[PDB]
Amino acid sequence: GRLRVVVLGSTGSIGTQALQVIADNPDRFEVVGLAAGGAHLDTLLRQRAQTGVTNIAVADEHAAQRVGDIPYHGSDAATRLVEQTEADVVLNALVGALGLRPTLAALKTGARLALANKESLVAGGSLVLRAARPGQIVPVDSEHSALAQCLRGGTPDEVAKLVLTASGGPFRGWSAADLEHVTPEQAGMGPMNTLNSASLVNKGLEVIETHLLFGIPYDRIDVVVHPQSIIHSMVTFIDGSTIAQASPPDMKLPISLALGWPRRVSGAAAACDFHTASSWEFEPLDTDVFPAVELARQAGVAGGCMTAVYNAANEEAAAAFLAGRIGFPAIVGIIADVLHAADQWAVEPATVDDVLDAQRWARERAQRAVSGM
Amino acid sequence: GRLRVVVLGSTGSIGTQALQVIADNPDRFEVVGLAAGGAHLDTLLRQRAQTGVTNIAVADEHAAQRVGDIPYHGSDAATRLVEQTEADVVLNALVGALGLRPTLAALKTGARLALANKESLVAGGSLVLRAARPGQIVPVDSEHSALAQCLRGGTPDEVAKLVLTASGGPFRGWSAADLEHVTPEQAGAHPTWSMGPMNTLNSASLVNKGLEVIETHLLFGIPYDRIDVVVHPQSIIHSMVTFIDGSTIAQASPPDMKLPISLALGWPRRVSGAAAACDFHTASSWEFEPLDTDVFPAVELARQAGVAGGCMTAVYNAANEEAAAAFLAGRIGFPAIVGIIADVLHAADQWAVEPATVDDVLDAQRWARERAQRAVSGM
Numbered sequence: 001g002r003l004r005v006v007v008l009g010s011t012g013s014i015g016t017q018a019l020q021v022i023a024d025n026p027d028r029f030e031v032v033g034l035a036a037g038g039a040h041l042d043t044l045l046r047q048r049a050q051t052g053v054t055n056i057a058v059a060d061e062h063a064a065q066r067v068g069d070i071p072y073h074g075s076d077a078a079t080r081l082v083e084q085t086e087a088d089v090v091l092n093a094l095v096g097a098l099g100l101r102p103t104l105a106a107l108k109t110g111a112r113l114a115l116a117n118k119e120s121l122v123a124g125g126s127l128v129l130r131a132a133r134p135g136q137i138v139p140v141d142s143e144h145s146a147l148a149q150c151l152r153g154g155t156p157d158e159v160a161k162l163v164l165t166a167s168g169g170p171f172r173g174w175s176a177a178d179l180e181h182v183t184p185e186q187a188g189m190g191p192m193n194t195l196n197s198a199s200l201v202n203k204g205l206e207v208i209e210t211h212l213l214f215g216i217p218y219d220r221i222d223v224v225v226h227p228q229s230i231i232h233s234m235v236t237f238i239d240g241s242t243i244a245q246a247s248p249p250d251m252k253l254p255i256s257l258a259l260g261w262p263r264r265v266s267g268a269a270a271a272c273d274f275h276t277a278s279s280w281e282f283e284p285l286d287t288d289v290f291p292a293v294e295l296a297r298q299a300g301v302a303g304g305c306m307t308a309v310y311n312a313a314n315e316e317a318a319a320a321f322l323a324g325r326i327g328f329p330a331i332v333g334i335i336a337d338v339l340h341a342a343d344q345w346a347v348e349p350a351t352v353d354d355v356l357d358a359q360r361w362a363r364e365r366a367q368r369a370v371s372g373m
Numbered sequence: 374g375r376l377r378v379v380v381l382g383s384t385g386s387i388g389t390q391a392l393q394v395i396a397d398n399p400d401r402f403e404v405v406g407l408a409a410g411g412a413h414l415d416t417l418l419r420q421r422a423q424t425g426v427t428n429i430a431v432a433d434e435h436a437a438q439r440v441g442d443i444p445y446h447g448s449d450a451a452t453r454l455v456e457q458t459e460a461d462v463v464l465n466a467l468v469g470a471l472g473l474r475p476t477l478a479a480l481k482t483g484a485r486l487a488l489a490n491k492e493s494l495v496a497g498g499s500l501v502l503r504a505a506r507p508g509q510i511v512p513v514d515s516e517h518s519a520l521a522q523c524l525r526g527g528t529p530d531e532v533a534k535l536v537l538t539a540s541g542g543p544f545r546g547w548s549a550a551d552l553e554h555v556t557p558e559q560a561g562a563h564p565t566w567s568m569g570p571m572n573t574l575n576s577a578s579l580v581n582k583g584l585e586v587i588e589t590h591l592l593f594g595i596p597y598d599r600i601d602v603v604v605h606p607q608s609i610i611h612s613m614v615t616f617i618d619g620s621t622i623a624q625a626s627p628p629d630m631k632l633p634i635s636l637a638l639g640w641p642r643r644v645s646g647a648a649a650a651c652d653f654h655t656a657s658s659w660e661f662e663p664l665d666t667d668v669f670p671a672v673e674l675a676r677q678a679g680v681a682g683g684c685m686t687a688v689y690n691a692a693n694e695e696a697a698a699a700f701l702a703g704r705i706g707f708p709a710i711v712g713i714i715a716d717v718l719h720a721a722d723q724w725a726v727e728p729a730t731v732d733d734v735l736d737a738q739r740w741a742r743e744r745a746q747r748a749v750s751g752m
């Protein structure tokens with residue numbers, strides 16, 4: 001009665017926490033596949049020995065060579081592993097839009113896709129949705145996990161609004177002028193999600209992720225700043241009732257629920273402790289200073305390949321910021337500049353190649369924007 | 374479709390708010406019966422005129438004699454109306470032990486019972502539960518309505534804890550020394566236009582929360598040691614459920630009883646536009662703090678009564694009513710209320726037997742009142 005789990009991005013934060021959840025629950029879960037990029041071979045070798053899984057994908061050819069005997073190696077390794085491994089659940093914890101092909105392959109096998117890699121859904125859009133049956137994608141992202149639990153509070157016709165909470169990042173309350181001086185070390189889960197959290201681009205991706213997972217119109221997806229990150233998101237129903245999910249921050253909770261959906265996993269995470277005092281605070285997002293969420297809505301409403309453009313433009317601008325080439329406020333400046341030139345990408349993708357064409361265009365246009373700074 | 378609703382206690386706060394919800398939602402609800410005590414006969418008669426409902430009951434015979442065309446009047450008027458009226462939902466918003474029999478009659482008809490009357494569960498206990506079938510009782514009060522909604526977040530087997538919120542009352546965070554000085558006025562403990570002095574006093578003493586803990590155990594079948602109370606002064610979070618994985622599901626709304634009332638009436642279906650939703654356009658905070666059980670032992674005493682079972686919760690509540698009355702009359706200090714409940718309960722083990730009849734419940738209450746009177750007077 002064990003679920004067979006493929007873990008993509010096994011050596012990262014989410015991947016190792018997932019392996020820990022699986023280790024703690026041998027009656028429910030069994031690891032049958034691992035994929036990693038090759039930057040952390042030490043961790044990967046330990047994972048092979050501990051799980052006893054030799055069914056492994058390594059993206060970097062040289063790193064795979066150095067290990068020896070890796071059955072899937074090279075840029076398509078993770079995808080081929082998914083295509084050729086019998087599984088009940090695929091956990092996609094890869095980072096970036098490179099998770100796109102493994103997401104599509106996972107869905108095509110019929111397995112539950114436990115999705116941490118929000119970018120593959122954001123980029124893929126209707127192409128990823130067409131590949132999925134209803135409920136096949138189960139969110140690992142903490143907010144979306146919370147939304148899915150809260151939606152149990154009523155029927156679909158009773159949903160008024162979905163309320164996505166945001167930490168606000170380290171620069172919550174900072175002025176536009178304050179942001180000009182943000183260093184990479186200040187804006188630094190992995191380096192991409194840490195940065196995306198600080199810039200609010202993560203929240204923008206999550207608005208798009210919300211629309212795609214739950215089919216709710218953009219004008220019914222609210223974002224509220226909640227610095228404590230105890231409330232992970234909420235749903236407001238048509239009678240005025242709001243149902244919210246709360247827990248001390250710990251990704252093992254949403255990971256555990258996504259792997260075993262619909263069944264909750266005993267002891268996954270610590271519960272809220274109401275025997276000590278606390279406060280849960282809410283404030284509006286300053287959209288003038290942090291316009292990334294609004295840009296995401298604009299990209300989402302345009303639809304088609306525009307969400308792929310939004311993400312791809314961020315990936316390049318973020319890389320440039322982390323390399324010390326542009327200032328912090330330039331990240332979202334570049335995204336806006338790219339999106340506003342992106343007329344032709346409103347068309348719905350027919351194939352993966354359409355998405356890849358949009359991203360290719362977006363990366364080039366982002367470089368052009370960087371070149372002008 | 375359209376639900377046929379009998380409103381018991383039509384002239385009180387819950388009843389009149391329910392009639393507003395019904396007036397606003399004629400496609401979903403129709404009134405087919407009204408019952409009141411008689412103290413507000415003029416209101417009931419206006420309700421008859423406004424709704425066109427002639428199927429009415431008045432408990433007080435003197436009051437009934439002012440009219441001449443009431444079909445149900447006298448001692449068990451509300452019960453007889455319930456027994457003889459075809460209905461989908463019975464809202465029981467009667468006050469005190471005279472809500473118990475109509476609850477029992479309503480359960481026997483096979484109608485859904487939207488329950489506000491606290492005495493039905495607190496005093497009636499196993500009498501009521503043995504009469505009820507799964508899902509038949511739908512709770513009207515904000516905490517229990519919150520729990521019912523949050524329980525949708527998992528299966529029964531996935532529940533770790535039920536967590537009730539408490540406002541903390543006017544003396545939130547006060548010390549034992551502070552409490553010695555409390556006056557009836559300070560406890561808000563006088564008649565107001567809609568509510569009696571017991572409501573704010575029970576809130577202030579934490580006895581109300583004790584009562585809600587007992588009802589929680591009986592409604593949802595969770596052991597007392599897994600029913601927690603947290604102080605939340607804003608009353609925006611109405612209660613929460615903690616599941617076995619560490620996830621907590623909470624229900625939140627600006628205070629407005631029309632929400633839990635609308636949901637009790639239409640259960641399982643939500644009533645569009647019943648109440649205003651939480652608004653996050655302006656900064657706010659939701660605060661939580663523990664209750665000092667040494668200063669406020671009312672909830673612990675409720676658990677003690679609840680665990681003992683039988684008629685012990687009837688004893689808890691009747692001792693409070695008497696102790697509370699003594700405080701209101703200057704006969705005892707504020708901290709002595711819960712002191713007297715404790716003294717009565719510890720002498721009450723004969724009442725741990727399950728009640729067979731309404732009269733068994735009434736006898737327990739009679740005994741508890743007398744015992745409380747002795748404790749107050751020192752006799």
Ligand SMILES: NC(=O)C1=CN([C@@H]2O[C@H](COP(=O)(O)OP(=O)(O)OC[C@H]3O[C@@H](n4cnc5c(N)ncnc54)[C@H](OP(=O)(O)O)[C@@H]3O)[C@@H](O)[C@H]2O)C=CC1
Pocket residue numbers: 008009010011012013014015035036037038039040041059078092093094095096098116117118119140141142189190191193251
């Ligand atoms: N971490 C968190 O708390 C949260 C994460 N998420 C999402 O989950 C996903 C991952 O999160 P996170 O664990 O922090 O990311 P990490 O940086 O921690 O790890 C990313 C994983 O992907 C692998 N990887 C990177 N590049 C490639 C590639 N080209 N081919 C194959 N594999 C590759 C890495 O292997 P290696 O490093 O050994 O090369 C690594 O195991 C992200 O999309 C993120 O948005 C969402 C919410 C919270």
Ligand SMILES: NC(=O)C1=CN([C@@H]2O[C@H](COP(=O)(O)OP(=O)(O)OC[C@H]3O[C@@H](n4cnc5c(N)ncnc54)[C@H](OP(=O)(O)O)[C@@H]3O)[C@@H](O)[C@H]2O)C=CC1
Pocket residue numbers: 381382383384385386387388408409410411412413414432433451466467468469471489490491492514515567568569630
């Ligand atoms: N008020 C609230 O917000 C809350 C209510 N509840 C519970 O719901 C129940 C009712 O609340 P509430 O509406 O405020 O009570 P109210 O005092 O406001 O009104 C109660 C109703 O009961 C009727 N009644 C009174 N005496 C008798 C009698 N001797 N025989 C028959 N009927 C009688 C009254 O008719 P008449 O006026 O003519 O005598 C009245 O319509 C209580 O048990 C309470 O604990 C729980 C939490 C909160």
Ligand SMILES: O=CN(O)CC[C@@H](c1ccc(Cl)c(Cl)c1)P(=O)(O)O
Pocket residue numbers: 141142143165166167168169193196197198202203228229249250
């Ligand atoms: O799902 C989580 N993320 O995507 C990380 C980014 C968000 C975040 C940050 C800190 C904590 Cl403690 C938590 Cl719980 C969540 P965001 O900053 O996007 O709300």
Ligand SMILES: [Mn+2]
Pocket residue numbers: 141142143206
């Ligand atoms: Mn997230």
Ligand SMILES: [Mn+2]
Pocket residue numbers: 514515516585
């Ligand atoms: Mn209450």
